[PDB]
Design an enzyme around this catalytic site. Structure first.
Site, PDB file in Angstrom:
ATOM      1  N   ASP A   1     -10.024  -2.235-189.733  1.00  0.00           N
ATOM      2  CA  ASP A   1      -9.756  -2.300-191.172  1.00  0.00           C
ATOM      3  C   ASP A   1     -10.995  -2.665-191.999  1.00  0.00           C
ATOM      4  O   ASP A   1     -11.573  -3.765-191.845  1.00  0.00           O
ATOM      5  CB  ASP A   1      -8.660  -3.333-191.425  1.00  0.00           C
TER       6      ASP A   1
ATOM      7  N   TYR B   1     -15.906  -4.613-199.020  1.00  0.00           N
ATOM      8  CA  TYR B   1     -16.474  -5.438-197.956  1.00  0.00           C
ATOM      9  C   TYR B   1     -17.970  -5.188-197.753  1.00  0.00           C
ATOM     10  O   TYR B   1     -18.628  -5.974-197.086  1.00  0.00           O
ATOM     11  CB  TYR B   1     -15.710  -5.277-196.629  1.00  0.00           C
TER      12      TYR B   1
ATOM     13  N   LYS C   1     -10.319   1.429-198.124  1.00  0.00           N
ATOM     14  CA  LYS C   1      -9.510   1.136-199.307  1.00  0.00           C
ATOM     15  C   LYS C   1     -10.264   1.531-200.574  1.00  0.00           C
ATOM     16  O   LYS C   1     -11.453   1.289-200.688  1.00  0.00           O
ATOM     17  CB  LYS C   1      -9.125  -0.357-199.351  1.00  0.00           C
TER      18      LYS C   1
ATOM     19  N   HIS D   1      -6.290  -0.589-203.022  1.00  0.00           N
ATOM     20  CA  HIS D   1      -6.581  -1.967-202.587  1.00  0.00           C
ATOM     21  C   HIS D   1      -5.699  -2.997-203.298  1.00  0.00           C
ATOM     22  O   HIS D   1      -5.292  -3.996-202.706  1.00  0.00           O
ATOM     23  CB  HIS D   1      -8.050  -2.278-202.859  1.00  0.00           C
TER      24      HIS D   1
HETATM   25  N1  LIG Z   1      -6.062  -5.748-198.538  1.00  0.00           N
HETATM   26  C1  LIG Z   1      -6.482  -6.914-198.975  1.00  0.00           C
HETATM   27  O1  LIG Z   1      -6.395  -7.250-200.142  1.00  0.00           O
HETATM   28  C2  LIG Z   1      -7.039  -7.853-197.936  1.00  0.00           C
HETATM   29  C3  LIG Z   1      -7.215  -9.207-198.240  1.00  0.00           C
HETATM   30  C4  LIG Z   1      -7.696 -10.086-197.270  1.00  0.00           C
HETATM   31  C5  LIG Z   1      -8.029  -9.620-195.996  1.00  0.00           C
HETATM   32  N2  LIG Z   1      -7.847  -8.264-195.678  1.00  0.00           N
HETATM   33  C6  LIG Z   1      -8.160  -7.698-194.335  1.00  0.00           C
HETATM   34  O2  LIG Z   1      -7.575  -8.653-193.434  1.00  0.00           O
HETATM   35  C7  LIG Z   1      -8.556  -9.008-192.490  1.00  0.00           C
HETATM   36  C8  LIG Z   1      -8.114 -10.400-192.048  1.00  0.00           C
HETATM   37  O3  LIG Z   1      -8.190 -11.337-193.132  1.00  0.00           O
HETATM   38  P1  LIG Z   1      -9.147 -12.609-193.065  1.00  0.00           P
HETATM   39  O4  LIG Z   1     -10.430 -12.233-192.440  1.00  0.00           O
HETATM   40  O5  LIG Z   1      -9.148 -13.204-194.416  1.00  0.00           O
HETATM   41  O6  LIG Z   1      -8.493 -13.768-192.235  1.00  0.00           O
HETATM   42  P2  LIG Z   1      -7.587 -13.938-190.922  1.00  0.00           P
HETATM   43  O7  LIG Z   1      -7.546 -12.787-190.015  1.00  0.00           O
HETATM   44  O8  LIG Z   1      -6.320 -14.531-191.404  1.00  0.00           O
HETATM   45  O9  LIG Z   1      -8.320 -15.187-190.233  1.00  0.00           O
HETATM   46  C9  LIG Z   1      -9.665 -15.197-189.956  1.00  0.00           C
HETATM   47  C10 LIG Z   1     -10.105 -16.585-189.670  1.00  0.00           C
HETATM   48  O10 LIG Z   1      -9.497 -16.941-188.406  1.00  0.00           O
HETATM   49  C11 LIG Z   1     -10.582 -17.285-187.481  1.00  0.00           C
HETATM   50  N3  LIG Z   1     -10.080 -16.870-186.145  1.00  0.00           N
HETATM   51  C12 LIG Z   1      -9.938 -15.605-185.704  1.00  0.00           C
HETATM   52  N4  LIG Z   1      -9.443 -15.625-184.470  1.00  0.00           N
HETATM   53  C13 LIG Z   1      -9.271 -16.923-184.130  1.00  0.00           C
HETATM   54  C14 LIG Z   1      -8.793 -17.561-182.980  1.00  0.00           C
HETATM   55  N5  LIG Z   1      -8.393 -16.813-181.924  1.00  0.00           N
HETATM   56  N6  LIG Z   1      -8.765 -18.923-182.952  1.00  0.00           N
HETATM   57  C15 LIG Z   1      -9.166 -19.653-184.013  1.00  0.00           C
HETATM   58  N7  LIG Z   1      -9.627 -19.074-185.121  1.00  0.00           N
HETATM   59  C16 LIG Z   1      -9.683 -17.714-185.199  1.00  0.00           C
HETATM   60  C17 LIG Z   1     -11.771 -16.481-187.955  1.00  0.00           C
HETATM   61  O11 LIG Z   1     -12.948 -17.167-187.563  1.00  0.00           O
HETATM   62  P3  LIG Z   1     -14.012 -16.481-186.579  1.00  0.00           P
HETATM   63  O12 LIG Z   1     -14.595 -15.238-187.412  1.00  0.00           O
HETATM   64  O13 LIG Z   1     -15.197 -17.538-186.494  1.00  0.00           O
HETATM   65  O14 LIG Z   1     -13.471 -16.096-185.267  1.00  0.00           O
HETATM   66  C18 LIG Z   1     -11.628 -16.534-189.466  1.00  0.00           C
HETATM   67  O15 LIG Z   1     -12.235 -17.727-189.993  1.00  0.00           O
HETATM   68  C19 LIG Z   1      -9.847  -8.927-193.310  1.00  0.00           C
HETATM   69  O16 LIG Z   1     -10.980  -8.853-192.465  1.00  0.00           O
HETATM   70  C20 LIG Z   1      -9.633  -7.587-193.955  1.00  0.00           C
HETATM   71  O17 LIG Z   1      -9.807  -6.563-192.956  1.00  0.00           O
HETATM   72  C21 LIG Z   1      -7.345  -7.387-196.660  1.00  0.00           C
END
Ligand SMILES: NC(=O)c1ccc[n+]([C@@H]2O[C@H](COP(=O)([O-])OP(=O)(O)OC[C@H]3O[C@@H](n4cnc5c(N)ncnc54)[C@H](OP(=O)(O)O)[C@@H]3O)[C@@H](O)[C@H]2O)c1
Length: 323
Positions: free
Chosen positions: A50, A55, A84, A117
């Protein structure tokens, strides 16, 4: 045939892997890191990737994908890549060029999925969050039905295999679903979804309309100040999540990801750490009991992390409606 390759059929006949790799890293992180961790994710067995214009990583994510096609072998058809369309390109005449621009940076011929988005149009330009003399974000007025017609045109042109939306509420999805002359409905709605905001009602709606709910922020976000208040509660430190993690000899993150798989939600997980990337794909190696799932359902509290509060005055702000 390995469970980690499990996919769900979309309403257009294409298939989406049920676990996706989130690629957003804040601007301070070296750009070349996205190349390395996307290669690592593919080695681990991730196939759904994704990303987005916002980004600022599509050149790097594309390089990793193409390098693994050239070799760490996958084939293009095994990869499911999402981009997106950002809010400043919602005017119909700049939708297709926006997709073609992303494809130029990716050096791929198509995306598997292209999302709106947000449901909110912002002022056209190079600045994603364009501001006025007082630092208030400048909005734009666009008929989203016309934006959607060009998304359909992009699918017909072969530039996107599937099309969908992100951060839409039920009434906003209905505006698209009830559009006269609709050709292709959204395959998905990618929304914030985790045990504190489980999206029961929107999930029920989506299922009734054959739309996949894709969970972003499924581990409670990366907690970066651009998007998320640091005083907000830390999801993965929740003592009930941790007790279930321990019972299963897994980690809180794995419990949060497995929760979504077992309720029919497609789930994203971002990690830029090698060990946690490899850990996350182990979501396919254990099961939660029906008793665990009812306890996890009880964590629901309508707590939203990605509030986008600087867009609260936009007419089409999605999160003030109940769902
Ligand atoms: N469409 C939208 O509006 C929108 C908005 C927000 C996000 N997104 C998409 O969603 C994806 C995910 O969102 P997100 O990056 O905000 O957060 P997330 O997936 O909820 O969480 C990421 C956090 O969890 C940590 N983490 C990951 N695996 C872990 C594990 N096994 N144990 C402990 N900690 C862990 C990561 O740190 P580490 O990197 O240090 O492992 C990071 O700090 C984004 O990359 C993007 O692709 C889309």
């Amino acid at each position: 045939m390995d469970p980690k390759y499990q996919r769900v059929e979309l309403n257009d006949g294409h298939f989406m892997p049920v676990l996706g790799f989130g690629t957003y890293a804040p601007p301070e992180v070296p750009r070349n890191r996205a190349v390395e961790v996307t290669k690592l994710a593919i080695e681990a067995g991730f196939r759904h990737i994704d990303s987005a214009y916002l980004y600022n990583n599509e050149e790097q994510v594309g390089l990793a994908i193409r390098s693994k096609i050239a070799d760490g072998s996958v084939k293009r058809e095994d990869i499911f890549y999402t981009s997106k369309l950002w809010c400043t390109f919602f005017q119909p005449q700049m939708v297709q060029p926006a997709l073609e621009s992303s494809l130029k940076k990716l050096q791929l011929d198509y995306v598997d999925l292209y999302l709106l988005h947000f449901p909110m149009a912002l002022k056209p330009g190079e600045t994603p969050l364009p501001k006025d003399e007082n630092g208030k974000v400048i909005f734009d007025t666009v008929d989203l039905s016309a934006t959607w017609e060009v998304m359909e045109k992009c699918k017909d042109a072969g530039l996107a295999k599937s099309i969908g939306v992100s951060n839409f509420n039920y009434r906003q999805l209905e505006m698209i679903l009830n559009k006269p002359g609709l050709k292709y409905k959204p395959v998905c709605n990618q929304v914030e979804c985790h045990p504190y905001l489980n999206q029961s009602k929107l999930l029920d709606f989506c299922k009734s309309k054959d739309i996949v709910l894709v969970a972003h922020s499924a581990l409670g976000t990366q907690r970066h100040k651009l998007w998320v208040d640091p005083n907000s509660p830390v999801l993965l430190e929740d003592p009930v999540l941790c007790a279930l993690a321990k019972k299963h000899k897994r980690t809180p993150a794995l419990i949060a990801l497995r929760y979504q798989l077992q309720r029919g939600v497609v789930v994203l997980a971002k990690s830029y750490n090698e060990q946690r990337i490899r850990e996350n794909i182990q979501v396919f190696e254990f099961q939660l009991t029906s008793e665990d799932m009812k306890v996890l359902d009880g964590l629901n509290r309508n707590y939203r992390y990605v509030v986008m509060d600087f867009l609260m005055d936009h007419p089409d702000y999605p999160f003030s409606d109940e769902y």
